[PDB]
Amino acid sequence: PHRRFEYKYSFKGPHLVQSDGTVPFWAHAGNAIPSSDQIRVAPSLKSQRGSVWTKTKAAFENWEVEVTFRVTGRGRIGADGLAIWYAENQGLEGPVFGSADLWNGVGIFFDSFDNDGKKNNPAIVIIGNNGQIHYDHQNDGASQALASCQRDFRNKPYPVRAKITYYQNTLTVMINNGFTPDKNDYEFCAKVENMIIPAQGHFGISAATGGLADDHDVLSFLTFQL
Amino acid sequence: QLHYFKMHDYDGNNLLDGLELSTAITMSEDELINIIDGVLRDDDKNNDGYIDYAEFAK
Ligand SMILES: OC[C@H]1O[C@H](O[C@H]2[C@@H](O)[C@H](O)[C@@H](CO)O[C@@H]2O)[C@@H](O)[C@@H](O)[C@@H]1O
Ligand SMILES: [Ca+2]
Numbered sequence: 001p002h003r004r005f006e007y008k009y010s011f012k013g014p015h016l017v018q019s020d021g022t023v024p025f026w027a028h029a030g031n032a033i034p035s036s037d038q039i040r041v042a043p044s045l046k047s048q049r050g051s052v053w054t055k056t057k058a059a060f061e062n063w064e065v066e067v068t069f070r071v072t073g074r075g076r077i078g079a080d081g082l083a084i085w086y087a088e089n090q091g092l093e094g095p096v097f098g099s100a101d102l103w104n105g106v107g108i109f110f111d112s113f114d115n116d117g118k119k120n121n122p123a124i125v126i127i128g129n130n131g132q133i134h135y136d137h138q139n140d141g142a143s144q145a146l147a148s149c150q151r152d153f154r155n156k157p158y159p160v161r162a163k164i165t166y167y168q169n170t171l172t173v174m175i176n177n178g179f180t181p182d183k184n185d186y187e188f189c190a191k192v193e194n195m196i197i198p199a200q201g202h203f204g205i206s207a208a209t210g211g212l213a214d215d216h217d218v219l220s221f222l223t224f225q226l
Numbered sequence: 227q228l229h230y231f232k233m234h235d236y237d238g239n240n241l242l243d244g245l246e247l248s249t250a251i252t253m254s255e256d257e258l259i260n261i262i263d264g265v266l267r268d269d270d271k272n273n274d275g276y277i278d279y280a281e282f283a284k
């Protein structure tokens with residue numbers, strides 16, 4: 001399928017922030033810092049929350065987003081992680097990787113912290129929510145996991161990239177693990193067949209820390225109409 | 227003149243997109259979205275949402 005680039009639903013450096021400290025076409029909040037070459041969505045401080053969400057919504061039947069980020073920290077263990085969002089509502093402030101709960105749409109969670117002691121982290125998680133569910137933080141949503149995989153996205157020598165495609169009721173998630181600089185060296189993570197999400201919504205990106213804390217930096221969020 | 231197609235190809239792909247055009251221009255978001263959307267319509271003959279030197283130099 002063809003791809004149209006949707007600038008109104010995207011950001012990136014090298015001039016990522018406007019002179020007034022704002023990110024064109026996106027609203028940012030919590031403790032997220034825009035800078036010219038990346039947004040530090042949540043800094044390596046205790047109990048932090050940040051989000052970046054689009055202003056306008058976007059009416060796209062099928063779409064693709066490529067997200068480049070780094071999640072850096074001293075420890076071989078870090079927290080709390082990072083979430084990419086499509087949803088009917090801006091979830092700016094909230095307990096869900098810095099974003100609002102009760103979301104209407106999908107959310108892919110890069111979870112640095114093994115909260116339910118299963119030695120199954122860091123991990124990528126897909127979760128549907130129709131407006132009335134509650135994210136099982138302490139259980140890393142394992143029960144609500146529409147689909148999921150296990151890649152270690154922390155502390156890589158090139159930045160990690162997550163391609164996230166929705167084509168004909170099938171959300172797909174490829175991931176490039178920061179090992180090569182081939183921005184297209186993706187590998188399979190997961191997939192959800194027969195999925196419906198709001199006709200128009202906001203795209204969003206958020207992160208958070210607590211007891212443990214990493215820097216969560218998103219260098220670019222690139223959106224495609226297919 | 228190629229010099230001006232290039233001034234803002236910051237990612238070096240030889241294409242201008244909305245965000246790269248944003249910076250050339252920068253004012254109210256709305257006015258910005260207005261100008262960019264105009265530049266697209268006018269110049270983007272393929273609807274990839276990018277403009278190549280063809281589309282640029284017309
Ligand atoms: O009391 C410490 C801390 O607890 C909560 O965060 C916990 C858990 O949610 C996190 O996954 C890990 C890693 O950050 O640390 C804690 O154990 C939060 O309520 C937080 O604000 C609080 O300070
Ligand atoms: Ca967790």
Ligand SMILES: [Ca+2]
Pocket residue numbers: 113114115116117118120121139140142
């Ligand atoms: Ca877990």
Ligand SMILES: [Ca+2]
Pocket residue numbers: 235236237238239240241242243246
């Ligand atoms: Ca370009």
Ligand SMILES: [Ca+2]
Pocket residue numbers: 269270271272273274275276277278281
């Ligand atoms: Ca074009």
